[PDB]
Design an enzyme around this catalytic site. Sequence first.
Site, PDB file in Angstrom:
ATOM      1  CG  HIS A 146      -1.704  -1.057   1.265  1.00 65.25           C
ATOM      2  ND1 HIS A 146      -1.271  -2.302   1.683  1.00 65.25           N
ATOM      3  CD2 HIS A 146      -3.228  -1.459   1.068  1.00 65.25           C
ATOM      4  CE1 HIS A 146      -2.637  -3.195   1.596  1.00 65.25           C
ATOM      5  NE2 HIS A 146      -3.435  -2.624   1.315  1.00 65.25           N
TER       6      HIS A 146
ATOM      7  CG  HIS B  88      -6.129   1.526  -0.855  1.00 63.90           C
ATOM      8  ND1 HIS B  88      -5.810   2.180   0.479  1.00 63.90           N
ATOM      9  CD2 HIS B  88      -6.278   0.313  -0.797  1.00 63.90           C
ATOM     10  CE1 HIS B  88      -6.143   1.155   1.258  1.00 63.90           C
ATOM     11  NE2 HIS B  88      -6.286   0.033   0.134  1.00 63.90           N
TER      12      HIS B  88
ATOM     13  CD  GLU C  35     -21.288  -5.257  24.406  1.00 61.20           C
ATOM     14  OE1 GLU C  35     -21.401  -4.869  23.149  1.00 61.20           O
ATOM     15  OE2 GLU C  35     -22.433  -5.399  25.120  1.00 61.20           O
TER      16      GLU C  35
ATOM     17  CG  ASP D  53     -32.395 -11.735  29.790  1.00 60.08           C
ATOM     18  OD1 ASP D  53     -33.437 -11.404  30.215  1.00 60.08           O
ATOM     19  OD2 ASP D  53     -31.205 -11.597  30.209  1.00 60.08           O
TER      20      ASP D  53
ATOM     21  CG  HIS E 209     -29.823 -12.184  26.240  1.00 59.71           C
ATOM     22  ND1 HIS E 209     -30.604 -11.623  25.211  1.00 59.71           N
ATOM     23  CD2 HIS E 209     -29.368 -11.172  26.704  1.00 59.71           C
ATOM     24  CE1 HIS E 209     -30.669 -10.370  25.402  1.00 59.71           C
ATOM     25  NE2 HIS E 209     -30.018 -10.197  26.669  1.00 59.71           N
TER      26      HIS E 209
HETATM   27  C1  LIG Z   1     -11.537  -1.765   3.472  1.00 61.24           C
HETATM   28  C2  LIG Z   1     -10.035  -1.964   3.497  1.00 61.24           C
HETATM   29  C3  LIG Z   1      -9.274  -0.639   3.377  1.00 61.24           C
HETATM   30  C4  LIG Z   1      -9.551   0.740   2.870  1.00 61.24           C
HETATM   31  C5  LIG Z   1      -9.238   1.547   3.776  1.00 61.24           C
HETATM   32  O1  LIG Z   1      -9.305   3.063   3.466  1.00 61.24           O
HETATM   33  P1  LIG Z   1      -8.813   4.139   4.302  1.00 61.24           P
HETATM   34  O2  LIG Z   1      -9.739   5.419   3.856  1.00 61.24           O
HETATM   35  O3  LIG Z   1      -8.849   3.833   5.801  1.00 61.24           O
HETATM   36  O4  LIG Z   1      -7.334   3.940   3.486  1.00 61.24           O
HETATM   37  P2  LIG Z   1      -6.659   4.871   2.544  1.00 61.24           P
HETATM   38  O5  LIG Z   1      -7.409   4.617   1.296  1.00 61.24           O
HETATM   39  O6  LIG Z   1      -6.378   6.367   2.853  1.00 61.24           O
HETATM   40  O7  LIG Z   1      -5.194   4.233   2.312  1.00 61.24           O
HETATM   41  S1  LIG Z   1      -7.580  -1.053   3.525  1.00 61.24           S
HETATM   42  C6  LIG Z   1      -7.870  -2.662   3.499  1.00 61.24           C
HETATM   43  N1  LIG Z   1      -9.403  -2.994   4.014  1.00 61.24           N
HETATM   44  C7  LIG Z   1      -9.990  -4.080   4.361  1.00 61.24           C
HETATM   45  C8  LIG Z   1     -10.536  -4.270   5.807  1.00 61.24           C
HETATM   46  C9  LIG Z   1     -11.910  -4.295   6.001  1.00 61.24           C
HETATM   47  N2  LIG Z   1     -12.357  -4.404   7.223  1.00 61.24           N
HETATM   48  C10 LIG Z   1     -11.466  -4.542   8.412  1.00 61.24           C
HETATM   49  C11 LIG Z   1     -12.064  -4.520   9.463  1.00 61.24           C
HETATM   50  N3  LIG Z   1     -10.146  -4.266   8.140  1.00 61.24           N
HETATM   51  C12 LIG Z   1      -9.654  -4.279   6.954  1.00 61.24           C
HETATM   52  N4  LIG Z   1      -8.555  -4.034   6.704  1.00 61.24           N
HETATM   53  C1  LIG Z   2     -26.476  -3.713  28.788  1.00 59.63           C
HETATM   54  C2  LIG Z   2     -27.894  -3.995  28.678  1.00 59.63           C
HETATM   55  C3  LIG Z   2     -28.841  -3.285  28.887  1.00 59.63           C
HETATM   56  C4  LIG Z   2     -29.225  -2.037  29.373  1.00 59.63           C
HETATM   57  C5  LIG Z   2     -29.629  -0.948  28.261  1.00 59.63           C
HETATM   58  O1  LIG Z   2     -29.662   0.411  28.528  1.00 59.63           O
HETATM   59  P1  LIG Z   2     -30.677   1.183  27.900  1.00 59.63           P
HETATM   60  O2  LIG Z   2     -30.480   2.633  28.230  1.00 59.63           O
HETATM   61  O3  LIG Z   2     -30.768   0.921  26.323  1.00 59.63           O
HETATM   62  O4  LIG Z   2     -32.253   0.344  28.651  1.00 59.63           O
HETATM   63  P2  LIG Z   2     -33.256   1.136  29.655  1.00 59.63           P
HETATM   64  O5  LIG Z   2     -32.285   1.185  30.799  1.00 59.63           O
HETATM   65  O6  LIG Z   2     -33.493   2.299  29.331  1.00 59.63           O
HETATM   66  O7  LIG Z   2     -34.226   0.406  29.927  1.00 59.63           O
HETATM   67  S1  LIG Z   2     -30.438  -4.101  28.410  1.00 59.63           S
HETATM   68  C6  LIG Z   2     -29.569  -5.582  28.688  1.00 59.63           C
HETATM   69  N1  LIG Z   2     -28.207  -5.295  28.378  1.00 59.63           N
HETATM   70  C7  LIG Z   2     -27.297  -6.355  28.069  1.00 59.63           C
HETATM   71  C8  LIG Z   2     -26.515  -6.476  26.782  1.00 59.63           C
HETATM   72  C9  LIG Z   2     -25.297  -6.118  26.316  1.00 59.63           C
HETATM   73  N2  LIG Z   2     -24.768  -6.057  25.326  1.00 59.63           N
HETATM   74  C10 LIG Z   2     -25.597  -6.235  24.002  1.00 59.63           C
HETATM   75  C11 LIG Z   2     -25.019  -6.258  22.719  1.00 59.63           C
HETATM   76  N3  LIG Z   2     -26.892  -6.640  24.230  1.00 59.63           N
HETATM   77  C12 LIG Z   2     -27.457  -6.767  25.477  1.00 59.63           C
HETATM   78  N4  LIG Z   2     -28.847  -6.953  25.548  1.00 59.63           N
END
Ligand SMILES: C=C1[C@H](CCOP(=O)(O)OP(=O)(O)O)SCN1Cc1cnc(C)nc1N
Ligand SMILES: C=C1[C@H](CCOP(=O)(O)OP(=O)(O)O)SCN1Cc1cnc(C)nc1N
Lengths: 675, 675
Positions: free
Chosen positions: B25, B259, B413, B472, B476
């Site tokens: 690249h 690129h 996460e 749940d 879950h």
């Molecule tokens: C989609 C791409 C890239 C294009 C990135 O565009 P940028 O604007 O960041 O880079 P620039 O053109 O300016 O050199 S590089 C490789 N890749 C595949 C790819 C897909 N998904 C994840 C999660 N990781 C990867 N590396």
């Molecule tokens: C962290 C949580 C939640 C809290 C969500 O807060 P919100 O403000 O959206 O809800 P409210 O308090 O207003 O009822 S509900 C369950 N959960 C675990 C959980 C974690 N990660 C993913 C990806 N999916 C899940 N469901």
Amino acid sequence: SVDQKAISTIRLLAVDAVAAANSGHPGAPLGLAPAAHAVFKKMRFNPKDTKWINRDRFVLSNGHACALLYSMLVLYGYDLTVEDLKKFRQLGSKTPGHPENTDVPGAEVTTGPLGQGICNGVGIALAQAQFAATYNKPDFPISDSYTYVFLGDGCLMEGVSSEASSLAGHLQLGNLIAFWDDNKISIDGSTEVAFTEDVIARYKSYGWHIVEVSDADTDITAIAAAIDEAKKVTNKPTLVRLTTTIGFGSLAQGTHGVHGAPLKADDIKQLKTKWGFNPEESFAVPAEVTASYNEHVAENQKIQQQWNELFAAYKQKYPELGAELQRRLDGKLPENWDKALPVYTPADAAVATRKLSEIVLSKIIPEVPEIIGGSADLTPSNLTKAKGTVDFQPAATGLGDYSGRYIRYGVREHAMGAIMNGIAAFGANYKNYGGTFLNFVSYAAGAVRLSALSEFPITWVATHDSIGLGEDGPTHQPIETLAHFRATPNISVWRPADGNETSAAYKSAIESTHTPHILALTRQNLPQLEGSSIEKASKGGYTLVQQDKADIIIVATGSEVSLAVDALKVLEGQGIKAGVVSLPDQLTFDKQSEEYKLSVLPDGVPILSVEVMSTFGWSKYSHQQFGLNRFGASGKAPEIFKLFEFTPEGVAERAAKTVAFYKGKDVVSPLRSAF
Amino acid sequence: SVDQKAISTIRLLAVDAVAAANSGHPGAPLGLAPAAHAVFKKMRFNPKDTKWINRDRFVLSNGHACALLYSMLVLYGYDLTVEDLKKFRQLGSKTPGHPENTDVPGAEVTTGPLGQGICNGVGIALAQAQFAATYNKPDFPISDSYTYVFLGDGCLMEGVSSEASSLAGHLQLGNLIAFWDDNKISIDGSTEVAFTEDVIARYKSYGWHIVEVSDADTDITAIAAAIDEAKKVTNKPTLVRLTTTIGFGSLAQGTHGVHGAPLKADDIKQLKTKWGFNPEESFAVPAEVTASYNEHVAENQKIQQQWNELFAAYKQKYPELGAELQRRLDGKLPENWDKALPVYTPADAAVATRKLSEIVLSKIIPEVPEIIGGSADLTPSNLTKAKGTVDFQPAATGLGDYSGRYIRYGVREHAMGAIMNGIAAFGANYKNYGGTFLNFVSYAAGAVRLSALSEFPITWVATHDSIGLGEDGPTHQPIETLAHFRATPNISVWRPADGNETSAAYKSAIESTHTPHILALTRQNLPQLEGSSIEKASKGGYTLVQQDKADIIIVATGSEVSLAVDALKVLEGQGIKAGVVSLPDQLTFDKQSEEYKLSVLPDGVPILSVEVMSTFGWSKYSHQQFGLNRFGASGKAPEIFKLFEFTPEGVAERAAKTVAFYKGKDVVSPLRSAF
Ligand SMILES: C=C1[C@H](CCOP(=O)(O)OP(=O)(O)O)SCN1Cc1cnc(C)nc1N
Ligand SMILES: C=C1[C@H](CCOP(=O)(O)OP(=O)(O)O)SCN1Cc1cnc(C)nc1N
Ligand SMILES: [Ca+2]
Ligand SMILES: [Ca+2]
């Protein structure tokens, strides 16, 4: 008023459902009941025809709040009753703890994993725009429906929602209307502890329109007005900020404790008395509420009746489009569409399966209008766009049109996966696909698993499947990826070896109605195999080279089938006779009859698997496994295969050791089991 | 000037490396060379001591641009030479196609999967703030370093970067300085096709400071000034917008074609002549550039020399803190820290392993200062916070302090996973953890895999591990999750059955230096087992119940070990004698001696595995597998176990069928293999 009584009814049904289960989430239902009432009164839907293609769609992205959704569905006379609400969260009920589209009438998608539903809503809205652009004509608004989404703070924290919201703003999806439950409470307490960004400013930066409702605990007039305002803004998705009190009305309102556990019994009593209900009664449904809701249903059914007449008139005025639309609404592909699939012979040149995939798409996209798809910024690498198609873009950009068929997802794998689920959820027989490198399908695992659980026929075009990609190195080379998805229920993971197998993989993917597909495709060229066909590959696993006196059978996939065939020749010089099995899709193979499967993997002969990735799963089909259970390397691909001994000689050596290991032993098929 | 010559040298080294490999690249290296020059001249680092704890850190989030990074490291005299650049992308070299911290001196983290590096930078900066708050004293700025990150459009599209950027703004991480390569080009062409959001407005909404450099192809004065400006803003991370031309200088500058593929030979010739280099020469390093860069290195080494004297004076003034800091910089845990681990007997009460985990953390956090961690909005569910600790927050919020030990990640996460990698990358013996539900570790797969490839000792506290969570429901309940991570190289996946096994799992996780851990923990209570101990569980797999005349051995994990023990009793009434093996970590078990492993899984006896999730992998350890290869259900957990026959009687039935299936057969250990 009756509207006030309806809101109280919704609130109390949800709290009573949680109480009966002694499990679930009362807080967001209490806070969102006014908005749910207002939105459903604006929506067009038929509880007796959940598949009407011009219905407005509703998605509960904050799926833990599903006691609210179930209450709405019950009150509107969907195929869900108060008796089902009494069985909330109980084994086997129609009211599971998070909504499941396979189980719950009126649940468009499966939500609960945060962030997914809003992205699904983006996909429903994308599909509606594409569908309307394809079919609508002057005086014929075949499709003009809206997509309404409820989401909370948790969905707004999840990165997948940022991806989809950036893309939806770019795509100017004006029929998407999302509602943020701005209650300032999550499980860890106040949003001040972790979520202090200016959400509204962020959504403006994506190109969304904003409406703020400061008193969403009571002001249904303002919520209705926000919907009307959103409908006037035809070139931007809208976010409606609903400032609510979590658990509104509870003694514990405005606290994290009301998010996710049943209310105290005395709290439920005071709720009922404050709102004019009998504190001794549970699951009350005042008949005036039913009457009010029935009026709206009856009006909606007259709207659908008129739409059916519009559709009949459309079929007379536009006979070809009308027949196409009818076929799609019947769930049927074009007659004999599969005659467009390319077929190869062993005399044809070697081709990478990514390029074979391009060729398939080139042939079938013109034949099957319900195919649309895209790539996550890998269009010239995945080879996912057919020449002579236009991109799906708002015409205002000059970069495409809503009638286009190719989606530029950007570097947004997770949202692509969840958007695909929404496109599938729209219906109308959409068969949609998304390209990335196989190793980065893993970025979208949250959505992929939901494709499987939701039974959506989406397709990942997952190229650069192995160490065969070469120089990009171990950060890009899959090891665990196929094992992960094969271990997930209801995922068809095709790893075709050649041109005929690639056509079989697409036949499966496009014909699917209930099973998502991942097509693992090569960077590098592979030969056309002697013995392959669409017919045999459509069985998922088949005997490529039959050897009636086999000392060993080698089972392989993808790029390793040609390797196995070359190893067979090395083995012949060592005095060992081998057969070869190609196993392009384990799930399809597993679904064949026991007798067919045993014809492929018989008793009485050792079986060695060969696939340049994890050996997990392979003991279903083999006695010994030659795989790659370490990370890869950055170098020219042939040198990496040599390093790891994925060569004809390396396979032959392991086959000869396998034959020797079973000398004197009684061998039964890997398909046999004790139970 | 010499600075102009240095920039040209960097550009041409990168292009020549790509040319030699005929792979890689060149575009982003060409565009970012001025910024790289400027940033490295501001950074404090020692090429001869890559682990100096007060160094500034650099992260290349757009890891495909690594020919740029390698050029900087070579020019500054890291343990990387021009001869290594000539081997870019070649098998076995120190210059792989994306940077790997295990292989490349001066690569802090492993990047290439887009979005990860910026999140890693957030974690390095979080760790630096926590470290400085812990150790700095008046007149003793032990830690005062910055974190510099380069990222492109692709990283900004990936949702993980949005998560981490929202959190970094909330955390007021003023020593983080990120640089956006604003070149308007990605693989699919112009960013106008998919990425039209107002990035700057979005970053303002997160609470970042912005500096814009409109002419970053040439204006190194402005880039240096942007760094100085960022350093004055102590309560906000800064994003520097670098408006660049991708491929600057190339005939193909400003196009997607530059690129990701080598330049044409004639293009390289014109680059060299325009910049005063010999078009016939490759890998040129003008001695004046080396001299200039050496001056900066020598100055930095004098800074480190003075820091070493400051550290010696700190040890005299603050003897206890100084000894703690020295021990951490030596990579050593406190002597006998593991005496704090809780120990249980079979007379003790049943406890959920999530609660056992809480208790462990409560005991070891006060004993081991380098433990910090958090949860993704699941603190009261995962039980990840020790009572009496303070949260990691900027003191200005009143919600915590930078000396705090508990991180509120919010519902993020994936970013949590990548931030953990950055905390580990900081060094100083940090042993950091992150809680979520096991099923949502999958949202972070991109980062988890990088923990394994990068050899970072991070820990996931992954509660609610199975259908045992109950109501749940299937959205879950993990099925595929352990198989996925067990199939990934270098992940220790502990599924402890009881109190002693939970302590062993933490002993492993905290002592780790090169292996990430996932601890799969229960919602539901489990009994203390007769036969468990920290000592035996530390072997990863062990004989819990030895039966010298066994008809069958049952191997199980987690919640299923107690089930196996209960099944043994049912089997005794059927006249079948069983042994039980507990296998809390397959990776640790696999690393034991062959003789130890065979003592646990001997020849001559059928072995049945029991684990309420996918059967993938289990044939390594068993002849027959009883698992759950379908999605779960929403109901009370005991009813779900009964539905799927994970009961003492259901296990016994399958054990009896296994004994019968092997009658008359010769059985060898599953550990045996042909090769
Ligand atoms: C989609 C791409 C890239 C294009 C990135 O565009 P940028 O604007 O960041 O880079 P620039 O053109 O300016 O050199 S590089 C490789 N890749 C595949 C790819 C897909 N998904 C994840 C999660 N990781 C990867 N590396
Ligand atoms: C962290 C949580 C939640 C809290 C969500 O807060 P919100 O403000 O959206 O809800 P409210 O308090 O207003 O009822 S509900 C369950 N959960 C675990 C959980 C974690 N990660 C993913 C990806 N999916 C899940 N469901
Ligand atoms: Ca909330
Ligand atoms: Ca770019």
